[PDB]
Design a protein around this nucleic acid. Sequence first.
RNA 1: AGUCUCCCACCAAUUCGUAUGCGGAAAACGUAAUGAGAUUUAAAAAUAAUUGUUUAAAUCAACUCAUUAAGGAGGAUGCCC
RNA 2: AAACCAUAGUUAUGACGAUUGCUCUUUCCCGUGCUGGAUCGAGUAACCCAAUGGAGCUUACUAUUCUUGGUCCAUGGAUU
Lengths: 104, 292, 152
Amino acid sequence: MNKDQAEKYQERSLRQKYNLLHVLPTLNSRALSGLYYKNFHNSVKRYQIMLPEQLKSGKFCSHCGCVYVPNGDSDELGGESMEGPKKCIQVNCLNCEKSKLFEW
Amino acid sequence: MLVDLNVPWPQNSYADKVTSQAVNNLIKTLSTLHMLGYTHIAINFTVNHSEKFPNDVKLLNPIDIKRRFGELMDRTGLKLYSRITLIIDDPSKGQSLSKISQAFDIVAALPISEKGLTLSTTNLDIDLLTFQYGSRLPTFLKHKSICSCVNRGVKLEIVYGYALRDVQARRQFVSNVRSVIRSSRSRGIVIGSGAMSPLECRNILGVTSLIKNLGLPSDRCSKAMGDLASLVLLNGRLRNKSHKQTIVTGGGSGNGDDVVNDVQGIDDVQTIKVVKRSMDAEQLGHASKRHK
Amino acid sequence: PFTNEAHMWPRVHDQPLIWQLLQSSIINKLIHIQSKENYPWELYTDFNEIVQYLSGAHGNSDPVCLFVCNKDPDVPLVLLQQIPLLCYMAPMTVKLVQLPKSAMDTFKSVSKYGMLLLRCDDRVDKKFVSQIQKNVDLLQFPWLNAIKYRPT
RNA sequence: AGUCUCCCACCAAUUCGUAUGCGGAAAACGUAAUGAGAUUUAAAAAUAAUUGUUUAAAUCAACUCAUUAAGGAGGAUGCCC
RNA sequence: AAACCAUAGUUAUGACGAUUGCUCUUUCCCGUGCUGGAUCGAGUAACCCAAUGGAGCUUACUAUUCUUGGUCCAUGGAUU
Ligand SMILES: [Mg+2]
Ligand SMILES: [Zn+2]
């Protein structure tokens, strides 16, 4: 395998994985969400390339693995509620009933 | 289903040019084999390992299955495969099997020494291990090596077509065949006929009688000629055509278009298979319910 | 991209001279009394009602204009996580605008937190939003493109 | 069959004086109840023995590791009664 | 200079003949059925072999190249 064609194959595979991690089932089906999340992370671990922390912070859920999304393609919302602080800022979802809170 | 994998080609070195009489005799012997009855025939091309191999690809295969054999097969009704036997005696540095294995289909060996035998059994990626039944055996063949090689792949080949050559050669042929059958535990045995003319060919029953007189049972002979021959053909076809047995470019819809069976359809200068669209997403999954 | 082009929202440099005049308007708003701030102009300054108004409670006025202080340190990364997707998914046309200079944290010092969305229908509001639609407009959905997540 | 382990002399004790889940003289030995784990791990892979494939990685099944000392008496719960 | 000792003992376990039993298939009979009886046949395999004795573990075996028991949130057909 040539290195120039291997790099391109790598970016193509990463693009395809992130694209499949999006549209209908990774949003709706929490099972497939977690599955494709695990697959993408096992694929990025094998290449040993660091991931951008800016997105790594608020990337996905930790209980099921759906994209944290509040309310050209009308889709499902990931996060149903996002309160103020009320003591401290938190975010909740629909797919499961757990919530993740961060401190200012 | 009968397979004959040791049809010799009238040429040993690339310096030779084959005349029309030899290819006509080969045509006659192929017609003879088709008359009485046969299913698969793979011609052999013997060459030595010591001399330099030509640095070409489109000149390494002097068989031309498409031009003459492709012209006769539509009238005959069978398929032909190209096989090469690497006769290796000493471990010289000339070794470029990555090209000959990919250009040919089946690659066999004919060792004369013990070191060459060991390296061909362990490291050399080959398909069949043939011994010189005309000459004497190199040394005393052991059991564990042959059994581990059979479990690992490569099997032994017995050439009953050589015993029809001379008078003194039959004794050495029998002395080698009995030792090979005793040391191989009668597991990885493939039988072939090394005849250069249709005059030394026999029927399946004659082969069965000769082999059962040699010492191998008849049911095992039929089993090895039916399934062990098809499997050793499939090995050499898939290791070359496909990847290391993970992805195959041949798609068998029914029971006739198989990687070893379908030979005129599958392209060879490349590995693509241009077929019209037959699988879309709107068709019913259940084949019993799917109707056109 | 998911957040890659979310870094590069505004592209014009005619902004500041009218921007601190917009802060002068902000003073005009905030100097009356608790009620007479929102008397002529609908201003909201609480993250709760910020997200509740965009949840879909009322759909009267299409043009909403939200303003955030960001692209600087000393700011809640955790809360700048999710506001652009929220303003996009909202059925209202919400023109999210991000303050271009970090020295304009007087906004942080005055209203509540550096967040403020307004219902742009008053005649001065659209008087200038018709001049800002000329200026900048950039808002997409990551599910559509998702081709530049973060390669290289 | 196999480059695996151990017994085939004793030692009121520098001699594994080891009452440690059970059986066993020992075993790099069999099995039982619970919890967890997957080069992101206690440890298996894509930078002592054995096996062609050589545990798992929807659920089950299989491997590894981490806990549960023997006998008698009192109270509570569940079953026939 | 011997301690020489195996209900195989030092790489020996040979040559065939006959009888019973098991698997499936071929048919008959009483009473559906019976570890039922009787012919017409095939098969009785594969892995492999001791060299002082015993135990544990792992690894090879059984596809017209003998067999047996159970399980399966495996699929295929039918009834409720
Ligand atoms: Mg032995
Ligand atoms: Zn969840």
